[PDB]
Amino acid sequence: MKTPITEAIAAADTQGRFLSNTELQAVDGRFKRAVASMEAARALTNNAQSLIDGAAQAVYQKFPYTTTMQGSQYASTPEGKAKCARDIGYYLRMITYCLVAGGTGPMDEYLIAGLSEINSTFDLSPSWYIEALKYIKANHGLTGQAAVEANAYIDYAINALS
Amino acid sequence: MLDAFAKVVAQADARGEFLTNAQFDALSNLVKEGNKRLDAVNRITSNASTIVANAARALFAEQPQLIQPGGNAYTNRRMAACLRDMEIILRYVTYAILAGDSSVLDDRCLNGLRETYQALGTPGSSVAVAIQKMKDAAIAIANDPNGITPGDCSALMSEIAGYFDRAAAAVA
Ligand SMILES: *[C@@H](C)[C@H]1/C(=C/c2[nH]c(/C=C3N=C(/C=C4\NC(=O)C(CC)=C4C)C(C)=C\3CCC(=O)O)c(CCC(=O)O)c2C)NC(=O)[C@@H]1C
Ligand SMILES: *[C@H](C)[C@H]1/C(=C/c2[nH]c(/C=C3N=C(/C=C4\NC(=O)C(CC)=C4C)C(C)=C\3CCC(=O)O)c(CCC(=O)O)c2C)NC(=O)[C@@H]1C
Ligand SMILES: *[C@H](C)[C@H]1/C(=C/c2[nH]c(/C=C3N=C(/C=C4\NC(=O)C(CC)=C4C)C(C)=C\3CCC(=O)O)c(CCC(=O)O)c2C)NC(=O)[C@@H]1C
């Protein structure tokens, strides 16, 4: 999984060498930034339900047809509404994992890989998830570097969907 | 591979849940103790050559059969291979220390090592003796109270010893 730490040792390993000061400084950077990252992760987790609920409604408001259009890929049924809330929660959970790991690894492996194939196969619109992510960014309530951390990973997800 | 953080994340994902306060606290603690971990890796790495060479000399002094004609470390080719292995083992052990998880060590080094030595005819028991030697020397250097801000690194030394023993068991 991609993290500043596994990355640092991956570099030393590919070079067949012991870790150097070059890699140690990298890991220290990660340890220091962890303060802001953990703050962001705890906050998003604490307010996970309201963020997911609010994000889902933001999507339905931006795209009203998803609440009425017939089809299993839409949120026009209780099962579809549940699938959607589920997905939004997955995205939020992944961002907290990224903050915890200090890298995109968690999202890269559990969500981004195969993402395009999935959305295409099940006729799910990337624009839906982008709107949910934009709502989370606008309303997570974080400030300072904690907000910088959260937004970096939220925007990473948005970019992966664009 | 995985580090201490990715490990917790992977366990959580398999269960589909966010992290608990206890988990956040645990990982937060690791970060709080980070400086000690960096010091240990820097110290062991900075003395890697001496650790390997001293352990190698000791091994051959105690087990002279390895260096007698016909022995497994006889000929410069085999001696070089042996020294290389010790450096490789020490290298992956330090990676595990930095990661706070043995995954990299188990996956990229110890996996199939047993089988490799068996096919070559290399005495894994002796390799384990060499590993144990580097462990004692590595911990002595990493935990040297001189030249560093005083503090307790006992838990860290216990963790480090665990990786060395893990490697020793995988080949012995
Ligand atoms: C246990 C191994 C021994 C010990 C360690 C100990 N070290 C510190 C504190 C610091 N360690 C560093 C080292 C680094 N920072 C880096 O970024 C890098 C890589 C380039 C390294 C190698 C630093 C900067 C500090 C803080 C400043 C200082 O010198 O004090 C502590 C204090 C704790 C902490 O977790 O921050 C301790 C206890 N002490 C011992 O007695 C053992 C022999
Ligand atoms: C919500 C923004 C909108 C929407 C969602 C919706 N999604 C599905 C089905 C699936 N969603 C996923 C997504 C993931 N699976 C994963 O493992 C991960 C990473 C951890 C993600 C992000 C997948 C794979 C599916 C298909 C398989 C399944 O059902 O689990 C549906 C159901 C579609 C169907 O045809 O049954 C829906 C309705 N729908 C909307 O209207 C919103 C705008
Ligand atoms: C020294 C402690 C003992 C010893 C060792 C010895 N080892 C070999 C040969 C090999 N060692 C490995 C191990 C690895 N290769 C890797 O890439 C990795 C991970 C990064 C590991 C752990 C392998 C694959 C070999 C065989 C291939 C090669 O040598 O290039 C030898 C050579 C034996 C021979 O040529 O017949 C020796 C001598 N020997 C001892 O007597 C000590 C107890």
Swiss-Prot record, chain A:
GO terms for cellular component: phycobilisome; plasma membrane-derived thylakoid membrane. The keyword rRNA processing does not apply. It is found in: Cellular thylakoid membrane. (2R,3E)-phycocyanobilin binds at C84. InterPro entries: Globin-like_sf, Phycobilisome_asu/bsu, Phycobilisome_asu/bsu_sf, Phycocyanin_a. Its main location: membrane. Pfam families: Phycobilisome. It is a peripheral membrane protein. GO terms for biological process: photosynthesis. Keywords: Antenna complex, Bile pigment, Chromophore, Electron transport, Membrane, Photosynthesis, Phycobilisome, Thylakoid, Transport. Contains one covalently linked phycocyanobilin chromophore. Light-harvesting photosynthetic bile pigment-protein from the phycobiliprotein complex (phycobilisome, PBS). Phycocyanin is the major phycobiliprotein in the PBS rod. Heterodimer of an alpha and a beta subunit, which further assembles into trimers. The trimers assemble into hexamers. NCBIfam families: phycocy_alpha. PANTHER family: C-PHYCOCYANIN ALPHA SUBUNIT, PHYCOBILISOME 32.1 KDA LINKER POLYPEPTIDE, PHYCOCYANIN-ASSOCIATED, ROD 2-RELATED. Belongs to the phycobiliprotein family. This is C-phycocyanin alpha subunit. It comes from Thermosynechococcus vestitus (strain NIES-2133 / IAM M-273 / BP-1). The lineage of its organism: Bacteria, Bacillati, Cyanobacteriota, Cyanophyceae, Acaryochloridales. The gene is cpcA.
From Swiss-Prot, chain B:
Its main location: membrane. It is a peripheral membrane protein. (2R,3E)-phycocyanobilin 1 binds at C82. CDD domains: PC_PEC_beta (cd14768). Disulfide bonds: none annotated. Contains two covalently linked bilin chromophores. Keywords: Antenna complex, Bile pigment, Chromophore, Electron transport, Membrane, Methylation, Photosynthesis, Phycobilisome, Thylakoid, Transport. The modification N4-methylasparagine is found at N72. (2R,3E)-phycocyanobilin 2 binds at C153. One of its GO terms (biological process) is photosynthesis. Gene3D superfamilies: Phycocyanins. GO terms for cellular component: phycobilisome; plasma membrane-derived thylakoid membrane. InterPro entries: Globin-like_sf, Phycobilisome_asu/bsu, Phycobilisome_asu/bsu_sf, Phycocyanin_b. It is found in: Cellular thylakoid membrane. PANTHER family: C-PHYCOCYANIN BETA SUBUNIT, PHYCOBILISOME 32.1 KDA LINKER POLYPEPTIDE, PHYCOCYANIN-ASSOCIATED, ROD 2-RELATED. Light-harvesting photosynthetic bile pigment-protein from the phycobiliprotein complex (phycobilisome, PBS). Phycocyanin is the major phycobiliprotein in the PBS rod. Belongs to the phycobiliprotein family. Heterodimer of an alpha and a beta subunit, which further assembles into trimers. The trimers assemble into hexamers. This is C-phycocyanin beta subunit. It comes from Thermosynechococcus vestitus (strain NIES-2133 / IAM M-273 / BP-1).
